[PDB]
Amino acid sequence: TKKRRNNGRAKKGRGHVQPIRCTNCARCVPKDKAIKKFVIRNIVEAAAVRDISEASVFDSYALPKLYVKLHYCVSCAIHSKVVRNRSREARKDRTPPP
Amino acid sequence: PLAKDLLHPSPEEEKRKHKKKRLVQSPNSYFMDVKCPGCYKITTVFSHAQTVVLCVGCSTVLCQPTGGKARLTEGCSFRRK
Amino acid sequence: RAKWRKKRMRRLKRKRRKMRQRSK
Amino acid sequence: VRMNVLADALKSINNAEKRGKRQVLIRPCSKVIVRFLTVMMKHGYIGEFEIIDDHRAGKIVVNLTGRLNKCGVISPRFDVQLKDLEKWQNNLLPSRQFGYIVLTTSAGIMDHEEARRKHTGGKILGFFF
Amino acid sequence: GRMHAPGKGLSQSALPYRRSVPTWLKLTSDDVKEQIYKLAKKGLTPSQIGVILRDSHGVAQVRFVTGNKILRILKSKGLAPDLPEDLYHLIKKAVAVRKHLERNRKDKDAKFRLILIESRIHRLARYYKTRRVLPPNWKYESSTASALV
Amino acid sequence: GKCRGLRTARKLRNHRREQKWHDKQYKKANLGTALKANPFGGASHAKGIVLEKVGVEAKQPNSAIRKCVRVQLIKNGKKITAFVPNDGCLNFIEENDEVLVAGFGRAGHAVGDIPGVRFKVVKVANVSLLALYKGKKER
RNA sequence: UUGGAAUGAGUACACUUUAAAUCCUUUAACGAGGAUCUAUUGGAGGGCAAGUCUGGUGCCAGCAGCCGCGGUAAUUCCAGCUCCAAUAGCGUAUAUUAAAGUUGCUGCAGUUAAAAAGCUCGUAGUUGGAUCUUGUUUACUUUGAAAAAAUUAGAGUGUUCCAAGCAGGCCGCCUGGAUACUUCAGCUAGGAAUAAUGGAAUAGGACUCCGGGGCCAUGAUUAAGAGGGACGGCCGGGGGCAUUCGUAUUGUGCCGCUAGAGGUGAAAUUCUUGGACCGGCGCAAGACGAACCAAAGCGAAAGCAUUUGCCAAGAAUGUUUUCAUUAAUCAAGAACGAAAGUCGGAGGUUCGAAGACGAUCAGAUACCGUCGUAGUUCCGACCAUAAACGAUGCCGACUAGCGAUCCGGCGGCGUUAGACCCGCCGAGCAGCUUCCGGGAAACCAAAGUCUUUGGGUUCCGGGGGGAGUAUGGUUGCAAAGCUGAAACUUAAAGGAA
RNA sequence: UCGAUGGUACUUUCUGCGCCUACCAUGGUGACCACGGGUAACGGGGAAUCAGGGUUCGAUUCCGGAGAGGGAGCCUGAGAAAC
Ligand SMILES: [Zn+2]
């Protein structure tokens, strides 16, 4: 049975796409089939932002961030629980969670 | 719309349709007399000219070829019948 | 598996050919 | 490519009747179509159709009466005789009480009843009921 | 759709219903024929002559002003090319691709596209021979194809 | 789809001609095979000499001993294994006696839980096995 | 239960029958109550009409086309009884037809059940727009002849009825021994719609003059929401070559400070007895082209992403340009066709089949780790196979709506210095809502317009195995590609839910 | 080669004809399936089964052909390659 209309990838009217490597296991995954996640986090987390700010040499220095674009294969994205299996009707929801 | 009149369509919808899909196909193009400000002779040029037309005497350039209706120069008339 | 069965078949064709060329 | 014009003419009518349309626009017209629509009109299956001249193949806007169940073509146009005409009446017509099989005979285009009264066979164009 | 392409475009000129010369066109039938001749002697093809007449001369259609077409007008005066223009441009394009394919033997797209162009050459020439436009001994060979152009 | 043309008779006739061979029933009865491999050679019955009495295990889930006889055909020398149909009729079949065997009911197919026996005994010693089972004939 | 009746089988005095007989028919005599003058053949779980009956047997013997029955209360076997079916017939085996719309013209299928070639070109083949009197060449249709009888259909006729026969009515006498069908091709006489073909274009044109004249309305249908070609401004990770940049990885020179670094679930193999790892300035080589990068673009698919230049192509759009059916799909044939693989060169940074070693395990010849050959890279020549997938041929028409998006074009407030905003048209990749409809359903605006079945056309499927095997041919350096069986075995295999 | 196709002249036959001979010509057939192979293939009128369409069968009393164990060659006669 065809489980998904897009076959699990965002490829339409296109023959081949260049692959990438999953961050957990370096395996060849198509760029559209990859479960991407652009994570923007601070270099200093909230548990340590107090000590770093009070020990700074500047009056007002904002801590930088880590702009990392993570890529995941289907298998590792589910073991890492970044995507869950949804109901047969809930799968059709293409909106990101709030 | 089960009883839409196909024999008597409104003129606002026939101009909307493609020039081939109309009830009777008719061009969306036309001719026009271009009067340059330098000379007095008027030249009958096509709207979708696609060539570089010139006035009699090589006074100036009338229009320029484009992907659609030709782009006229400054100070010219058009829309003849 | 249908692919390893296909591989066992081609490994068997290659043996039947060499056994046939010996008595050729 | 459009290898048969009577096919696309009757297909547009059959689909417009299924949608409850009042009028249908047959884009390509021909002599066979106008005489086919006339056979359907003489028996009351369609209304008055207006041929549109555009210095080309021409278009027709047929007025649908809602009395037509299905009109279709028979491709290719087989050669039909008088002894073989009853065979097509059992395969195409829905009953022996109504429905007609249009034939193109040397005497002109007519249904199977008029072709039998004139006692002349020919080729089969289509059917309607 | 296209003959050797998956495109199904509809772009094409749609002639008006009125097969009549407009009242504002003063050029007579003979005045247009003189313009066709002077443009044919300049090297313009029948498809190019009708463009200049359409733009710089207001002649929307010479088949409505004059009783015949451009190619028939040039044939009467003997100013028509030996081979037709549509076949001349199919051979010209095939020579341009084959010339490019000599100094570039690694583009298998131009090699595939050359088969398409020469397919339309042999299709079109087959039609002109049935209409006796080309002699029965005529043949398109890639060797002397550059000489016909 | 299919070709519906006025001059497509040869195309349709040749297509059906070559597609009928994909039908295993038509191909079986239109080639040299399955007729020479058939021990009867196209006959409904055949006579043979009983080589030995053999018991054939009934296939699962059933469990029994099918009383059969290894028969050598007289017409071509082929050795087949018939089946003594009725209850206890194996005792009526002597050794090296001529018996008339026929198909088991299906065209070259094994009938019932018997593995490969596709024949059955009809007569024995020129006496029908049904007459010996009912006591109306002897020997 | 009791009775008299009636009769054929049988039987013969004989006739008849026939060349002579027999048979049938006719008919004396004779011939029926257990009218013993005896109806069998297959079945009684279901399909399939008919037993919860009794006894025996106890997964035994056997039944059973199929599904199944039997392991100690068998409705299925061996039997009694009873019942059912056809009936002087009834079973069995095999071939064959219908069933089978499971061979398809009528009339099937190919998204997932078996299935559409990886993709495109292309000959034959098949099929091809509209248009010409409305108000030569053929095909086609109609008519006649022909198509031997017998058979078949069928008219007449009490062979006692009937299958048959062609004979037989009537009180010499008058009636039959008909007709229809016989494909295709050929022959004939009408029809002229539909579908092909021809006529005048360098006029060596028709009709008239009577080599030159006159004359004809003097001879070219349309310009496809078919196609080719030109042209216009564009557009695209389309292709090729040549340049160019980027950081990274590995290696290396120098400098710095240090004993650990690498790796793992945990470790070890390994790198460091010192200068590994780390930091700095560099350098060299070979790959690769991040983020931007999307259910976006392009290309026939495979496939395609740094810059710049060059080369020749391409769709779409625009067109009151040109040609005028040149078209569609395609046996044969042909171009291209990921990766891996093969051969010959160059190069081998990374990665890494094989291989080694270190872990884990009962064992790992695996997963995991440290290396590492071929390979991965480039050039030329092969290979031609992928879950080459949208598991869905191509062309064309039609049948809903909506918001977006890519390209081109078009006209409209306004903002900005083309960008944005609002619509429309054509082209395309998609999305969604719908009781359009379809389907076994999942699902599908096509997988719809399908028992209300026929637009054109190619390839291809026929239970599951055997088996893409055997053999033959062909292709290749090879690996293997293409074509491709049968014996035999099996009652399911499988799809969706 | 040693007739395949055609032309010319014979020869021969009951006659036309590469039927045959001699001299020339290089043809003739084929994906519209030639050639080759198989047929448990005599052909047909017909039979069975069939809503239509079909499928299958036709050694078998009628017609035509063929053969008389296998080939081949002849006699006689109007007529036979006869059993
Ligand atoms: Zn992963």
Automatic annotation (TrEMBL), chain A:
A single MF term (Gene Ontology): structural constituent of ribosome
Gene3D superfamilies xrefs: Ribosomal protein S26e (3.30.1740.20)
One Pfam family recorded for the sequence: Ribosomal_S26e
Keywords noted in UniProt: Metal-binding, Ribonucleoprotein, Ribosomal protein, Zinc
Binding site for Zn(2+): C22, C25, C73, C76
GO biological process, any: translation
Superkingdom classification of source: Eukaryota
Basic and acidic residues: bias regions: 86-96
UniProt GO cellular component terms: cytosolic small ribosomal subunit
InterPro entries named among the record's database cross-references: Ribosomal_eS26 (IPR000892), Ribosomal_eS26_CS (IPR047864), Ribosomal_eS26_sf (IPR038551)
Family statement drawn from the similarity comment of this UniProt entry: Belongs to the eukaryotic ribosomal protein eS26 family.
Name of this protein: 40S ribosomal protein S26
Automatic annotation (TrEMBL), chain B:
GO BP annotation list: translation
A Pfam family assignment: Ribosomal_S27e
Cellular component terms (Gene Ontology): ribonucleoprotein complex; ribosome
Record field: compositional bias (Basic and acidic residues): 1-15
Region of interest (Disordered), ranges: 1-22
Required cofactor(s): Zn(2+)
Keywords, comma-separated and alphabetical: Metal-binding, Ribonucleoprotein, Ribosomal protein, Zinc, Zinc-finger
Metal-binding as UniProt keyword: yes
Gene Ontology molecular-function annotations: structural constituent of ribosome; zinc ion binding
Cofactor note: Binds 1 zinc ion per subunit.
InterPro entries per record: Ribosomal_eS27, Ribosomal_eS27_Zn-bd_dom_sf, Ribosomal_zn-bd
Family assignment from sequence similarity: Belongs to the eukaryotic ribosomal protein eS27 family.
Name used for this protein in its record: 40S ribosomal protein S27
From TrEMBL, chain D:
Secretion signal span: none
Pfam families named in the record: Ribosomal_S8 (PF00410)
Record-linked InterPro entries: Ribosomal_uS8, Ribosomal_uS8_CS, Ribosomal_uS8_sf
Annotated SUPFAM superfamilies: Ribosomal protein S8
The keyword Ribosomal protein is assigned to this record: yes
GO cellular component terms, A-Z: ribonucleoprotein complex; ribosome
Keyword Ribonucleoprotein attributed: yes
GO biological process: translation
Recorded superkingdom: Eukaryota
Listed name of the protein: Small ribosomal subunit protein uS8
Source organism of this protein record: Xenopus laevis
Automatic annotation (TrEMBL), chain F:
InterPro entries for the chain: NA-bd_OB-fold, Ribosomal_uS12, Ribosomal_uS12_euk/arc
Any one Gene Ontology BP term: translation
Compartments in which it is found: Rough endoplasmic reticulum
CDD domains for the chain: Ribosomal_S23 (cd03367)
An example Gene Ontology molecular-function term: structural constituent of ribosome
Keywords: Ribonucleoprotein, Ribosomal protein
Lineage: superkingdom: Eukaryota
Major location (coarse): endoplasmic reticulum
Gene Ontology cellular component terms for the protein in this record: cytosolic small ribosomal subunit; ribosome; rough endoplasmic reticulum
Pfam families in alphabetical order: Ribosom_S12_S23
Family: Belongs to the universal ribosomal protein uS12 family.
Matching NCBIfam families: PRK04211.1, uS12_E_A
UniProt protein name: Small ribosomal subunit protein uS12
Species: Xenopus laevis
